[PDB]
């Protein structure tokens, strides 16, 4: 029912402006639209800045000559309804004229949602609008918001910078919070998308109004602390008032140091949010736009006095609120305060300038040049307003503004892109304690065009960084797999795999094939070396020495028997059988020596033949001698003495043919086998049935030999030598019958073979040659 106050300045062209002079209405007061208290930087410096900027423009003959600029500043109160009311007041002149002077353009407001609300109304009347701090990502769609321009970039770059910051310090389990509205929602969406792409897990997401009460902030803080101590970092893409409410809640709950909140341009370097709550915000990292101070604004501003300022309707209330005084006789006196107001009070003390101030000034020049450019095209030679540009067209002004390009207050260049945005860069600020009860914001980094550079010795002042926000500790030691419960990728539990399994993938282990073992770091199953060499092994080599002794037993006996042909004992029996048995014993000893060798193909070529040929040939002499002894009348048609030799030759030929057939039935080759996972051995292939068959023939021959010896035992002949031989045959049969079953169950096949063959050869040789040797000696 009562109109608000407006700050107006006369001129030929009138430009509107919406500034947040007062705080927004609190809950239980939004319906009446009752604003709060005045503001220092956001409300009262910007009004004076616009007034002085227009005054300076009016004194510039090069820019818009012979034209005067007026203005109307109104209060938006950081609220959508109040700003909508003021915009309706702006457009009421044109609305009535359709059925004072019209507004050609509007500067502001400063928040994204309020800017959208104002733009929706403004675009129907063709009024270009330029913002200076509304950096929402969805305001760049010219299909919906056509008459909107801004001298600042969108918040997509802010989201990218925040993602880079969290990536650099290895934050992987970070909580998130934003504020109601276009700005917070869009920025949090972008941050969530980029974090998901880069592999960062968010514990939970929360939203809250900056107008909420204490209970809401207390509940929010309790929810945030429910995730402690895992999520030690909170990404707060919210406004300054939300951060201040969080700090007040933290003080009320007695929490300090438990969180590291990372903010955005809403809380950039403002001392408003950390006044009286510095201890709750130490160590917080924030990001701000890059904008240096303006000096002539300070020169003009620091000399203003309440009794001589007749342009600002909100200045006496400002003076009283800031200095906590009351002006004695002034018209706008507030009697709430006391102690009156001194005449030596000055505005220089405790002065801090708005951090976006230059941006605002740019938003006032960007419009002006636009008009200038328009005046250079509609009326080329004329100076001043003309009939060709009366009234100013909204579409022509918009198309002239979209083409503008000039130099800013900081020396940079201002020019809009296809979406009506302007480039910019960012600074990374750190809030910390410098002295004793002294806190300040310290510039620690920069971000520009995708490049981030920060100094890490200024943050934390050491290399002991705050414990990184991780849901699970990295426990992959090269033998341990991580597994997921399906809730969050950053949360996992790690368990070992099998000892023979090597870690092929970071999520699973793979087992090696037979004959291969995992390496030191469980990456690569190289082939296990095969151990086959046994020449230097103690057990076989010593046996060879025994065989070597047997070699001497072959050499001495043969030499003595050869040179003793004249002896009747040697001439008593045929020398052919003795030579045959000596050759058989020698070949058996040679096979025993050759058994211990590398499993080459040539070695296994004769190993199968030698194992069976020597016992068969050597014991053929025994059966030949028994047949010759039985051929006599006492032993008993086959009276031929030489028939013994041909029978032995036939037997040897039959044995050789059987051996050759067995060899042809299966060719031998080196075969590698793996009896155990850690045991691999290389031996030439030899089937058990292949070995058994020659043994059966020799056993049958020995059994036939024993029958002949038993019948001939009683017959005395050649110094009772017929009583002998039988003992050797019995011992040979006993040792063979003992060897047959132990061979299958033995774990050292070749060792048992060589020992058995050597023992049989030695026993036969000795037990059959000792009596003749003694007789010769």
């Amino acid at each position: 029912s009562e109109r608000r106050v407006v700050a107006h300045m006369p001129g030929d062209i009138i430009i509107g402006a919406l500034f947040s002079v007062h705080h927004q209405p609190t809950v239980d007061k939004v319906h009446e639209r009752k604003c709060g208290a005045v503001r220092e930087q956001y409300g009262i410096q910007r009004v004076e800045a616009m007034l002085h900027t227009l005054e300076r423009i009016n004194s510039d003959p090069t820019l818009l000559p012979n034209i005067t600029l007026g203005c109307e500043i109104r209060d938006s109160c950081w609220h959508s309804a109040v700003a909508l009311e003021q915009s309706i007041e702006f457009i009421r002149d044109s609305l009535i004229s359709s059925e004072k002077k019209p507004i050609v353009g509007v500067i502001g407001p400063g928040s994204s949602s309020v800017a959208i609300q104002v733009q929706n109304l403004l675009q129907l009347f063709n009024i270009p609008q330029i913002a200076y701090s509304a950096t929402s990502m969805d305001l760049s769609d010219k299909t919906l918001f056509k008459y909107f321009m801004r001298v600042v970039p969108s918040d997509a770059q802010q989201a990218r910078a925040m993602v880079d910051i969290v990536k650099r310090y290895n934050w992987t389990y970070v909580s998130a919070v934003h504020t109601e509205g276009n700005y917070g929602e869009s920025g949090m969406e972008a941050f969530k998308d980029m974090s998901a792409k880069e592999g960062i897990c968010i514990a939970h997401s929360y939203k809250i109004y900056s107008n909420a009460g204490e209970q809401s902030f207390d509940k929010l803080l309790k929810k945030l602390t429910s995730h402690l101590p895992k999520a030690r970092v909170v990404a707060c893409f919210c406004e300054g008032m939300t951060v201040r409410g969080l700090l007040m809640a933290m003080r009320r709950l007695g929490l300090a140091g438990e969180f590291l909140l990372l903010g955005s341009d809403g809380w950039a370097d403002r001392y408003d949010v950390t006044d009286g709550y510095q201890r709750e915000a130490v160590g917080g990292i924030t990001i701000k736009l890059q904008s240096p101070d303006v000096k002539w604004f300070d020169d003009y501003y620091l000399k203003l006095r309440p009794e001589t300022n007749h342009r600002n309707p909100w200045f006496q209330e400002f003076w009283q609120h800031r200095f906590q005084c009351r002006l004695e006789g002034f018209p706008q006196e507030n009697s709430k305060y006391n102690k009156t107001c001194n005449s030596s009070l000055t505005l220089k003390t405790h002065h801090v300038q708005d951090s976006k101030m230059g941006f605002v000034i740019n938003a006032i020049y960007s419009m002006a040049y636009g008009l200038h450019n328009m005046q250079m095209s509609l009326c080329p030679g004329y100076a001043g307003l003309c009939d060709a540009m009366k009234p100013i067209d909204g579409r022509k002004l918009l198309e002239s503004l979209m083409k503008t390009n000039f130099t800013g207050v900081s020396g940079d260049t201002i020019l809009f892109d296809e979406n009506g945005d302007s480039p910019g860069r960012y600074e990374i600020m750190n809030f910390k304690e410098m002295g004793k009860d002294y806190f300040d914001y310290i510039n620690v980094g920069s971000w520009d065009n995708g490049e981030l550079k920060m100094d890490d010795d200024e943050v934390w002042s050491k290399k002991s960084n705050i414990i990184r926000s991780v849901c699970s500790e990295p426990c992959e030691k090269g033998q341990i797999k991580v597994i997921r419960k399906g809730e969050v990728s950053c949360c996992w539990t790690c368990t070992p795999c099998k000892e023979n399994e090597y870690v092929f993938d970071e999520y699973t282990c793979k087992a090696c094939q037979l004959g291969s073992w995992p390496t030191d770091d469980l990456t690569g199953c190289d082939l296990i070396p095969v151990q086959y060499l046994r020449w230097g092994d103690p057990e076989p080599i010593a046996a060879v020495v025994f065989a070597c002794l047997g070699l001497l037993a072959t050499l001495f006996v043969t030499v003595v028997f050869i040179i003793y042909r004249d002896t009747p004992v040697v001439k008593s029996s045929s020398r052919e059988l003795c030579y045959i048995i000596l050759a058989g014993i020698c070949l058996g000893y040679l096979c025993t020596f050759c058994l211990i060798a590398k499993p080459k193909q040539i070695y296994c070529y004769l190993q199968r033949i030698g194992i069976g040929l020597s016992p068969a040939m050597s014991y053929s002499a025994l059966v030949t001698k028994t047949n010759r002894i039985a051929r006599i009348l006492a032993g008993s048609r086959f009276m031929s003495a030489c028939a013994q030799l041909v029978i032995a030759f036939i037997l040897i030929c039959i044995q050789l043919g059987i051996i050759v057939a067995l060899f042809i039935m299966e060719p031998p080759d080196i075969m590698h086998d793996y009896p155990s996972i850690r045991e691999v051995y290389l031996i030439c292939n030899t089937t058990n049935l292949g070995v058994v068959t020659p043994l059966g023939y020799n056993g049958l021959l020995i059994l036939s030999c024993t029958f002949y010896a038993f019948k001939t035992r009683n017959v005395p002949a050649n110094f009772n030598e017929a009583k002998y031989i039988a003992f050797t045959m019995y011992t040979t049969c006993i040792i063979w019958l003992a060897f047959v079953p132990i061979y299958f169950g033995s774990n050292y096949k070749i060792i048992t073979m060589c020992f058995s063959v050597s023992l049989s050869a030695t026993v036969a040789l000795g037990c059959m040659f000792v009596p003749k040797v003694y007789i010769i000696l």
Partner: nanobody
Amino acid sequence: QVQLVESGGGLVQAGGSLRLSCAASGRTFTSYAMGWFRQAPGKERESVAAISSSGGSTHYADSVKGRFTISRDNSKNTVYLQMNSLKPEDTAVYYCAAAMYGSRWPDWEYDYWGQGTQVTVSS
């Protein structure tokens, strides 16, 4: 913009009491301090009383101290002046003025002015 109208003046006997009303047409009335002026023949227009925008602060001249009373009503947008124990020397024309952007009283910049009304005293 506001338009100020005057009422309550006329002719009174000595020792009487009067109430003068100044009514402002137009909104934004609560953001304007108010003041009263009087002018008599052979003299110059001199202020008698003033009140701040929200009330609670009243200033009076040394001549009319203890006799005049200035009051406001923002619900109906009307400012009242009460004169008690009037004297024959107060016969003059009275004006009501609205001020903003001022200094310590009586150093005010009055944006708007009223019509004024004659007050006469008979002994």
